[PDB]
Design an enzyme around this catalytic site. Structure first.
Site, PDB file in Angstrom:
ATOM      1  N   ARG E 107       1.027  -0.545  -0.120  1.00  0.00           N
ATOM      2  CA  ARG E 107       0.525  -0.044  -0.078  1.00  0.00           C
ATOM      3  C   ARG E 107       0.995   1.765   0.230  1.00  0.00           C
ATOM      4  NH1 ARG E 107      -2.173   4.233  -1.425  1.00  0.00           N
ATOM      5  NH2 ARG E 107      -3.376   5.350  -0.138  1.00  0.00           N
ATOM      6  N   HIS E 134      -6.341  -0.596  -7.714  1.00  0.00           N
ATOM      7  CA  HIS E 134      -6.124  -1.364  -6.599  1.00  0.00           C
ATOM      8  C   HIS E 134      -7.641  -2.188  -6.973  1.00  0.00           C
ATOM      9  CE1 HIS E 134      -8.141  -0.075  -3.244  1.00  0.00           C
ATOM     10  NE2 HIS E 134      -8.019  -1.429  -2.652  1.00  0.00           N
ATOM     11  N   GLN E 137      -9.532  -4.252  -4.660  1.00  0.00           N
ATOM     12  CA  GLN E 137     -11.138  -3.313  -4.663  1.00  0.00           C
ATOM     13  C   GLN E 137     -12.085  -3.955  -5.236  1.00  0.00           C
ATOM     14  OE1 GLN E 137     -11.655  -1.009  -1.447  1.00  0.00           O
ATOM     15  NE2 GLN E 137     -14.122  -2.108  -2.368  1.00  0.00           N
ATOM     16  N   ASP E 229     -16.835   7.259  -5.455  1.00  0.00           N
ATOM     17  CA  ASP E 229     -15.457   7.351  -5.304  1.00  0.00           C
ATOM     18  C   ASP E 229     -15.544   8.652  -4.547  1.00  0.00           C
ATOM     19  OD1 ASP E 229     -13.214   6.498  -3.579  1.00  0.00           O
ATOM     20  OD2 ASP E 229     -11.517   5.947  -4.684  1.00  0.00           O
ATOM     21  N   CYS E 269     -15.879   2.391  -2.701  1.00  0.00           N
ATOM     22  CA  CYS E 269     -15.429   1.970  -2.529  1.00  0.00           C
ATOM     23  C   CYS E 269     -14.789   2.353  -0.676  1.00  0.00           C
ATOM     24  CB  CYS E 269     -13.980   1.271  -3.088  1.00  0.00           C
ATOM     25  SG  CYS E 269     -13.576   3.329  -3.015  1.00  0.00           S
ATOM     26  N   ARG E 297     -14.158  -7.945   0.230  1.00  0.00           N
ATOM     27  CA  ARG E 297     -12.291  -7.320   0.502  1.00  0.00           C
ATOM     28  C   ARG E 297     -11.746  -8.969   1.622  1.00  0.00           C
ATOM     29  NH1 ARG E 297     -10.235  -2.380  -0.312  1.00  0.00           N
ATOM     30  NH2 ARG E 297      -8.107  -4.091  -0.018  1.00  0.00           N
TER      31      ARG E 297
END
Lengths: 313, 313, 313, 313, 313, 313
Positions: E107, E134, E137, E229, E269, E297
């Site tokens: 990350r 991502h 996700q 988002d 997300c 997730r």
């Protein structure tokens, strides 16, 4: 798939389509495990109080076997053998049972009786059959349809006979899952109107459809499934044969069956009255799936139990 | 020893002597294991549907305990609590049960009822008692005789009383195993003639012997075992005492018993009517083995279950 | 703590205070294990024959669940389903059962019936309720009192109502453990005089106290616990309301309750007749502990079973 | 003992005395198991989200070790390392965390922050310390007192210093359990008045007592325990020494200590500022139990976790 | 399904549709197992190095919980706590980590940073979030869509807002799986053109479709899903409100939402800025699935880890 | 081999050669087990508190992975996240930690800090790095040398660079094990004189040798190993390049390396500053073993932990 941990199973109208698919997917996994001999004692030490008000073969032994396979124990509690018989309130027996068992399944006359059980018990309560609905039968029923047709959405599912408890459940689950449901009863013997409208809103949202006819031959046309059940005992051949003359035209036989698709499924929740709602030649016919449908009570209920008592917290 | 995997146990006439010895040898091994505390949960996850039409102590709890010891689960299904009560056919309940359980034991009136169960079920069906035969009792009975005499061939086994279901089984198993069987009944109360001839062919082949007298004092002479059962209830002391005057001379007491070998075994399948077919002094006598014989129902039936449901394929 | 291996549990008068504490200490350990999810299948392969003569909710499912948690199996034997029904003697069924199961629990009318069971069985026999006593209820009851008050010695335990079987047990256990027991009944409805004197000798030795009043309002003063049960059915509102006028002043309500300590415990063995021996407002009151008390039947009986069938030799 | 399954632990005022004893009894059993080497991985596969807003030694590692011993996993989530830091709402992080972990422990400034956590999370939330209360410290504290004095009821527990979060908890738990609590603070530095009255109602019901003095030497007389904590940082020695002159007379030293019972317990929740609230000679004195008290955070919290996440359904 | 043993997961463009379905099918099996309580410690003894450059709630605890459930251990490595901080090269830390752990999840800000990690590490490297993509996700996102719609092919998936990293992933996975994807951004804030063309080739091959609008109200018409988002922080409300005036028309509210199918799914997300990209009424609306999406997730990443570290050789 | 149960590992000077071989032999056994997949969860339920004062990659994850492999749990305790930060004394945190964990590893500035940890903790304390020594690095280092040369006695081990903490450890372990150690530093940058003399007494007793040069080209002649580390940061290129001009001649490059045996081992404890103490061409050269050396931190520390926390009493 979503959690069902702690849930009651009284009526499928308060279940989402995804919650029903969760049960069916889990049930298929358990069934394959059972066929290949993979043990799954997921409820070891857990217990299920089974409260029965009526004779039962399918609900009785499918729940009792399901707890055995899962490693726990079902108690067979004939309501006549409990202090219910002698006056103890439903509320109070739900309360005391809640201090001993991990779930309760009730096979009752009055649906209000198992609604009260759910209300007062602090463990999940499962309706194993009431005058109003038969949700575990519908789960088995649409498991069977998914298995034989590969899908549920858009299959044409036709019930002919008395608009009763399993017709309600057939209607509700079918319309949650997008199927094309049609129900055909003798003119005063139709499903509750609350349930018909539930069915209609469900189909509106799922994209499936409900349809209430009164001509069985009309209903079954090009059907994927033809489903029936025992006739309304009520008016027990009143004069000496009124019950027959009104339900008898709704009898599933080789002629009625003629009209459905050739690969149609004959379904019946059992027990059947041979020569009444159905004839030997249909039920024992290659197109009948009543033994596979009956078997799926075990797999779907195993799924229910593991999911409502297993998602533990 | 030979496989019994998948077999029904309705009547011992369709069993070979070696198939019966297979059960007895397995039963002795299980019994020794039980006495030394060696676990043997060989049927984990398996279930036995027990269908009962009559009150039962011995058949009920010996089968229910046997499944517990073997790691599985027996369902106690009073036929009054099933949909049999409400009309569902035997064929259809055997069929639906076959989709849930791994074997069925029935305790029934009419032998045809458990023959139909076997016919329609796809799992083994065990006759736990019928009007015609009591095969699990005979297995226990000759287990006990083997244990006390060290052998069965040539021991003289005498039944006095009503030629009923357990006499049939006593006769058949005894003659398959080479024993010297004699049965003495009041003049119209003899075993079925089909069974007498079965007995005779059996003894002819096994080298044992059958003999049908009508003088109990004659029958028991130099006996190794004296066996009785409850009197023919039929004609329930008709006038007010006809049942007694004809069966009463066939009552096992210290005088009748006098005639057998000193080390004779007193046997009774139970339940006993003290003061009728037998007196307190005989049944509670040092020569009585009725509690060891009753115990062997558990060990022999454990053997049966493991062998018919355990030889799996 | 001391061994209870092999013991019958008919009546607590033949138990020492230390033997009762053994059960309570073991029961608390099992209960904590149950709350934290620690398994304890200490009786794997063992079986309990449960003989019932009456409807039962609490005794039935607390024993049946207790055997499940402990890894063994309880058999639910309605005495109507056994050959007891057809005449087999108690002695003979205790004897045959002894060859199959590892303990027997009986729920019977006549205490002599379960005393005979204990006499003839070679396995432990537990009285799950008789007309004379209810020892497992008393164990649960004083477990609950120990849990809520932290002690039993010197707590003031007051029973109002019919001097029956659970009052006997309340009296006996309380006086073995040093509590201050008082029992108040309508004038002809008092505990057996044998039990009152047992109570008195017990309190004399334990340093507790017994006291038999006839004014409920007098009895409950400054009580730590107020306990009642259903009224003497006997004389079933005879004329049409005699039963009520004599027991009704002994009804536990907000006024009677007013007199006890503020932190008093309301107890009732259940089932309750709401509006009779007790009012909704008391039993559903924050001071009522009837659901915790009912729950402790499971934990205390699990302790009993493990101790009488587990101390094995 | 009673179930705590699913419960939040924010403040002990919403706990009954029996619920607290449940934690302490379970904690003692776990501690003995730990000393004898008996494993107890009762939460295998379970996870605890630990949210920290401040540096921590005791709360951090006692919770993290407790999950390790129980077989599960604690996540150390510094709130600075979460998206809380960047604006995500408390409600939304409680909600998302609820889909991943099985419990949440928060070490926060504002108590409202962990009340909101509990409000929005569907798993148990434990306050590991807030400005308002420190319930796990109080559990450890009274575990230690029970262990050293054999009891809690009637022991005289005296806190001197700033009426803060752990004084609140000391007060509340003490008065639920019947202890005699006294709190002595500099004149404007007393416990919240909501908590003082909670304490008073608690003692009224438990039979214990609360008392708020302002003379430490007065407070500690004949004390069983003397307890202190760090001084109110607030007004950080304002001028350059105001904080000291008002709290310094409340410093626990050999003279103050002189007045308590000889066998008194010196307690301190830690971390300590040596030479301030306490002197080396007291804390390192034979009468100090601060290391045993600190250790009991592990055992009591293990009890909490097993009970709120283990009683699963 | 195909093997993913040893694979990096940086970007889904180098995954086939079948490789993605492998993850989703495995993820559904793990999720059902999790709901029914079936353990699956498939990575016992294995470890995952988690390298974080930014605050994280979802990526942090979904990976850390996933390793716990699988029996292994995730290390939370804030890049500030590693020698990366002090100058050690990425290549060298990937190399040294490869000698200790079995996979690495990063990350990171710059995608090149996790591409270098993958390049130099000899264990799988998973992008838990980068400025470019991502992927985990998107896996969760299309798992959720499959679960709620029963399919992915042909469902109309509409993203409105800043063309960022999760839009890229939404676009790529959607077009690999045959969905109908449309992305609508403020005029200069669109997805990378490399990704748009990837999307177009993907849809060309999968039979799905991509479409890049600039009118959110236009985009969402008859949508099955509406996804947004957080807005481009870049230009942080520049003047004092430029960021708002260009992204604010792209805000998901009850009016925008009005246009989609009634049974549309609202997805986000997280974390969300309530009152900005979305309003309380939509996100907390019955049509929102953000908590189920966030939960997935855990299940999808558990699938990834088991598949890339479990297919072992 | 000898017991190390309960031992601190601060500095290798208080270890015998046999105690070091015990670690290396155990480490080789663990490493082979790891390569063949043999599990070894020897510290199940045990915990290691890791206290860090500085960024760390190697010490951090080699200890954290080692506890995972051994079945226990390492806590990553940044000293900034503990109450050390807020003033709690070292002595007091060692004391409280001792009541929770089973060992402590510290990564600290001042060696006195971890000596105090060892002094006050009642569990083993391991120095994971201090300004004075790096014992776990030396264990890894000589494990690697034993593995590549088959022996340690008499191999010529040359360190060039700043006489720091890992040079001390290199010196001490080498001279305990009989190796021929030479250390070459810029003229004022030599190892502590206490350590040089320790080295000399060690070599005198072990038969190995120590030698302190100041010409790197002189030092490395015919070397078996050439070892370097980062330059003395101190005087951080003072003027703007003083640090370089004095350490730069001590840089390991292809020319310096030219002089050692052809099969020489290039070692570096990492992290490396490429282009400073070493060049890409040497460290990435076939003769470099820095990745195998770094890996051995895991195996040697696993050995340490099992031996100091596993030899339990």
């Amino acid at each position: 798939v979503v959690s069902l941990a702690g849930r009651d199973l009284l009526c499928l109208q308060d279940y989402t389509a995804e919650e029903i698919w969760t049960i069916l997917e889990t049930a298929k996994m358990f069934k394959i495990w059972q066929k290949i001999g993979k043990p799954h004692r997921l409820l070891e030490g857990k217990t299920l109080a089974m409260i029965f008000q009526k004779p039962s073969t399918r609900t009785r032994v499918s729940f009792e076997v399901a707890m055995a396979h899962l490693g726990g124990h079902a108690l067979y509690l004939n309501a006549q053998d409990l202090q219910l018989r002698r006056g103890e309130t439903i509320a109070d027996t739900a309360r005391v049972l809640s201090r001993y068992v991990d779930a309760i399944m009730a096979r009752v006359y009055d649906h209000k009786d198992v609604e009260d059980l759910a209300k007062y018990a602090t463990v999940p309560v499962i309706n194993g059959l009431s005058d109003f609905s038969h949700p575990c039968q519908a789960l088995a029923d649409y498991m069977t349809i998914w298995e034989k047709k590969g899908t549920i959405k858009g299959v044409k599912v036709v019930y002919v006979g008395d608009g009763n408890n399993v017709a309600h459940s057939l209607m509700i689950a079918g319309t949650k899952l997008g199927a094309d449901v049609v129900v055909a009863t003798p003119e005063g013997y139709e499903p509750d109107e609350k349930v018909i409208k539930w069915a209609e809103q469900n189909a509106a949202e799922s994209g499936g459809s409900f349809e209430l006819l009164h001509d069985p031959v009309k209903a079954v046309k090009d059907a994927d499934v033809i489903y029936t059940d025992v006739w309304a005992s009520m008016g027990q051949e009143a004069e000496a044969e009124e019950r027959r003359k009104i339900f008898r035209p709704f009898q599933v036989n080789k002629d009625l069956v003629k009209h459905a698709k050739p690969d149609y499924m004959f379904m019946h929740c059992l027990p059947a009255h041979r020569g009444e709602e159905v004839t030997d030649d249909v039920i024992d016919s290659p197109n009948s799936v009543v033994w596979d449908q009956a078997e799926n009570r075990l797999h779907a209920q195993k799924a229910v139990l593991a999911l409502v008592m297993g998602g533990i917290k």
